[PDB]
Amino acid sequence: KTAHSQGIEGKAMSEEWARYYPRQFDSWKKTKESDNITDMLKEKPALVVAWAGYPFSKDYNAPRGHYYALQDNINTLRTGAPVDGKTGPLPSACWTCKSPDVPRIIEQDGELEYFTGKWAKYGDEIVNTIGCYNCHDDKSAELKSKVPYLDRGLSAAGFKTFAESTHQEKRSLVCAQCHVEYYFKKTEWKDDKGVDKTAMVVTLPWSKGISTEQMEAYYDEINFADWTHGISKTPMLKAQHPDWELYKTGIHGQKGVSCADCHMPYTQEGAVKYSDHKVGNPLDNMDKSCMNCHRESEQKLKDIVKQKFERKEFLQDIAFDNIGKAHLETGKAMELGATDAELKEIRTHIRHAQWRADMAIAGHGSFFHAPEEVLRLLASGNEEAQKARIKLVKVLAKYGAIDYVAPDFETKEKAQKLAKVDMEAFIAEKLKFKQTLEQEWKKQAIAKGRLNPESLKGVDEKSSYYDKTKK
Amino acid sequence: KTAHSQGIEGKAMSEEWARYYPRQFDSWKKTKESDNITDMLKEKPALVVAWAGYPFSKDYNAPRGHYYALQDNINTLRTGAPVDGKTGPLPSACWTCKSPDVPRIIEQDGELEYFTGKWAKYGDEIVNTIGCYNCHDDKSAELKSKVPYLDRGLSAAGFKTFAESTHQEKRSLVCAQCHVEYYFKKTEWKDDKGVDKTAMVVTLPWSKGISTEQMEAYYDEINFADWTHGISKTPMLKAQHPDWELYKTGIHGQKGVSCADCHMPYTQEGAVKYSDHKVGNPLDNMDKSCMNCHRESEQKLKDIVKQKFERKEFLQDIAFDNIGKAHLETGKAMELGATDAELKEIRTHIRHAQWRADMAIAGHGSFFHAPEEVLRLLASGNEEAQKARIKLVKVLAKYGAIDYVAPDFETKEKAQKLAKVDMEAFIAEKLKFKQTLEQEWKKQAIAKGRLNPESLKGVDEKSSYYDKTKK
């Protein structure tokens, strides 16, 4: 048994686990070191056009350390500027994979209640970032999935549940609680008090399997759409970090190598085995992350990964360039009077093209985890985009614009203009939120004992729209 | 030293090496077991359209055992029906990678002379198939490259020559004498007798590197074309089994695993090491070919290779379908009166699209040797094809045929009709050649002592146009 077999008071706060596991706590906190903010819309402006009419066209950055998950959830322009617990663009489900306070609240008020309401609803309750309680039982310290939607998805896919899985599998599944693709399923229900409520439940689109094509069929079957494209008015599907799903198609995943083997490698100290909890880039610690199974120079292994990235980049830019043009050309055809009937097939091609290409790039490590599937998907996506563009030429020709040239979107600025994203306004509004409601959230949480100020050190120095500079 | 340190009389005939190496001779002869003829034009009729106006649109089969190399060179419709040593469609260079008699003749008459004249020129001299002398020195038995064009290509690419390479590298380079992409360079020269002659020299397009893109730049720089497309009149480039070049981009090649490690695995017998000379499919002998480095079930490893093949197939069919349509649509535009000036850009896209896609599939093992490069190349090729088709729509529209639908070519029969290939005639003509001139070639060779009848056992029972049935 552990030294805390009856549970841990204040378990949601990882600092509460330090007295029992100083080592794991210490390395866990070091994800603070990965504080770089890479503005993906600036790096890949084509993404702005792809996501026109959706929050991702406003703000989308690459992932950084777990230490910043909660704060980035707050800082992203995607969550907007609520004025209270009933305002704001997004729902409560946006907290789900950002805090150990999530299972705390789900365990206290129930799944449906948690998934009911605005994101702003839990502003002063969900204040801790990715912590011990998100992956560990506070009595036995064993690995555990704290979110019901995962087992729900695993079952539907014909997979064993978390409890039924092997230890090695659990070393990847704890990650799968968050590092997976999902959608919000509008769900009606009634509380014990009789009140009728509507919940937005996190659901893994795995009922037909975990391949991109199976998920596609899944979404088409229920005629689902995450949003109607702001430019082409196409029923779009958004892919979100399907890290685990893609990893499963890769050679490492097929061989049984877990996420932890590379991202949380062991360190033996005579009888005692320690897992590095500083979840980050394995390439920074190759001796422990790779050389334990590979017998090759670190530079060569690094060069190989670099090659894979270049390959992915090559196909990514091609696919999203044609996808972008397709959206714009469809928008042009619409302007000339083309009917929905004339654009139906084209829009279906665009929907599938982007779903496949987004699934390929949404998982930032997929280019390495499953290179072959990433390349094939980008190629498949590009083909659907081009099929749409060949048909678009004919629609444009019918309306006298066969020589139309879709505008360029090589910079985030130009792309956001086409996507009609008023950045200055969103940023101004966001800052007001942060300077008022956010600080009130933090002050109240600290007063109630839900948040420890120590955890806020250097947590809010950067975002895509501001950089106070240092550490 | 060996037991034949002064050389071997009749070295071109592998049977002459049997007295010294019965083991290697025995397994070497067993490639006779791989006698399957897979008609690739029947399997992938899109290839017929791609190669319209070129010999490959007539006959193209997958590779089988080395035991059949020489005979298949004779049977393929590509070599046609010579009536003497000065007739026939192809040059003498077509023997180059099919017989140990090649180095014998090159060593006797010189490189230029060998590469001068018709294929039919050496009909009764080049009669032995891939043999010991193609890869071994007849005095020391050491591995050796017998063709000057290889070192020539290696140097141009910044690689070390064969003699400068390591032993492990030689285990792959002996294969590179033939398993590489090449072109015939028209070369003028004068013999010691003063006569002016024209030679067609085998040349490796490696002066800018061995990547598909570098070879492309190489061919474009000299405005080279293997043929003018019979349908689109595009200056085409033909890729031929770039097995070694692609293998070099793969993980095995980068790690130093040679062709021999998988295709000619060792067998230890107490102090004595034997190389299995039955060059074939490693998957038939996985315990010796793969399990020597991998610790996984054979079925799983097989399933993985199968996955890679399906991935390649997926992208291959897409690329060649769009390439086929592009050719046909260009042909249609031509019929309507489109000018070469209006079709120049389109034709450049088609040339590059097919060069890249052909380079990806011409090496039948590339899907496994270098999966990532194969997928990327097929994707790149497809994109160039689609860029051509988008432009083609506009050219067709200008000429009043925007709704033109390129004819289907889902069967070899339909494809060969579009490619205007009169098969019945070519086959009839070929049979007459085989029944007359070919038999005379074999009778004369046997009479002169250049050919041993034993080597002809079951060598000519199959082709793409006839199957006497058994072994």
Ligand code: HEC
């Ligand atoms: C509601 C729609 C959500 C909002 C708003 C955010 N998320 Fe997530 N999220 C999750 C993971 C595993 C990552 C990291 C890997 C990756 O991003 O590719 C993220 C990351 C973010 C970030 C930082 C990156 C960015 O700028 O986009 C933000 C700002 C963010 N998320 C906001 C996981 C999950 C998840 C688990 C299943 C859900 C339901 C959500 N995220 C929902 C939202």
Ligand code: HEC
């Ligand atoms: C002159 C233009 C040539 C003719 C006619 C043939 N070849 Fe070749 N060839 C070589 C290899 C390594 C292979 C095997 C791998 C593969 O085919 O992908 C081949 C195979 C053939 C075959 C059998 C397959 C088929 O039906 O196409 C035939 C009929 C054939 N070749 C005819 C190697 C070389 C090579 C070495 C550099 C040269 C110069 C040529 N082949 C030339 C011709």
Ligand code: HEC
């Ligand atoms: C949900 C509660 C999560 C769990 C469980 C795990 N991760 Fe995570 N991860 C999550 C978020 C929201 C983020 C984004 C953080 C941000 O503010 O940008 C991440 C990020 C990562 C990263 C990126 C690290 C970096 O760039 O420095 C990696 C490599 C990563 N996560 C890996 C990972 C692994 C292997 C996990 C299981 C052991 C794991 N995460 C769990 C959310 C969640």
Ligand code: HEC
């Ligand atoms: C999920 C994303 C995790 C978070 C957040 C934390 N831990 Fe963890 N821990 C995780 C894995 C996958 C593993 C390895 C499991 C295995 O048996 O292989 C661990 C392991 C531990 C252990 C056991 C000893 C060790 O391997 O180091 C302990 C005691 C432990 N973790 C503690 C711990 C604490 C205190 C955390 C918060 C500060 C914490 N973990 C977070 C995954 C995750």
Ligand code: HEC
């Ligand atoms: C052991 C548990 C492993 C760890 C940790 C890492 N790798 Fe690995 N890798 C391993 C296996 C068993 C295999 C499958 C092939 C086999 O030998 O059975 C691989 C394969 C690769 C590959 C080749 C496939 C490819 O995508 O090109 C590469 C390039 C590779 N591994 C790199 C790599 C790196 C950089 C790692 C650290 C981040 C890493 N591997 C860890 C086993 C294990």
Ligand code: HEC
């Ligand atoms: C070793 C073989 C790995 C396994 C198993 C998993 N990951 Fe990984 N991951 C690995 C590498 C080499 C990289 C690329 C590093 C680079 O910067 O080039 C990644 C990357 C990720 C990322 C992207 C992080 C970022 O860009 O900020 C994430 C979020 C990530 N990996 C998650 C993750 C998960 C959840 C895994 C299991 C399903 C997983 N990785 C396995 C190496 C390895």
Ligand code: HEC
């Ligand atoms: C030229 C003289 C060659 C040398 C040297 C090597 N190969 Fe070859 N190979 C060559 C030809 C002309 C053919 C086609 C034979 C036919 O009649 O179809 C082949 C075929 C192969 C195959 C296919 C085997 C099968 O399908 O059963 C393989 C796997 C192959 N060759 C491999 C290979 C290797 C690894 C070599 C070096 C050790 C090698 N070949 C040398 C011509 C020549």
Ligand code: HEC
């Ligand atoms: C090229 C395509 C080859 C042909 C045709 C033949 N041999 Fe070969 N042989 C080849 C390789 C790549 C190797 C391995 C080299 C190494 O040292 O790793 C060999 C090896 C031999 C040997 C050495 C002992 C052994 O490894 O078995 C002998 C004695 C030998 N080869 C003989 C031989 C004979 C008699 C052949 C014709 C019947 C023959 N080889 C053809 C490549 C090739």
Ligand code: HEC
């Ligand atoms: C030893 C000399 C090898 C032989 C013989 C074969 N493989 Fe291999 N393989 C080997 C290494 C060193 C690596 C690189 C990764 C590493 O562990 O360092 C690999 C990798 C693979 C892979 C993974 C990459 C991929 O394309 O998915 C696979 C699937 C694989 N090897 C399969 C395989 C098969 C089927 C073999 C026999 C025909 C084979 N390998 C032989 C080393 C060696």
Ligand code: HEC
């Ligand atoms: C092991 C890791 C290999 C190395 C190294 C090389 N080859 Fe290979 N080759 C290997 C496999 C698993 C396969 C596919 C088998 C299947 O049928 O699925 C191949 C295939 C080829 C082929 C195609 C043969 C045919 O389709 O008839 C050829 C001609 C071939 N390989 C040649 C070859 C050469 C010359 C290599 C070195 C440059 C080489 N292979 C390396 C496995 C391995």
Ligand SMILES: [Ca+2]
């Ligand atoms: Ca989604």
Ligand SMILES: [Ca+2]
């Ligand atoms: Ca060529």
Ligand SMILES: [Y+2]
């Ligand atoms: Y405590």
Ligand SMILES: [Y+2]
């Ligand atoms: Y990162």
Ligand SMILES: [Y+2]
């Ligand atoms: Y691979």
Ligand SMILES: [Y+2]
């Ligand atoms: Y003799």
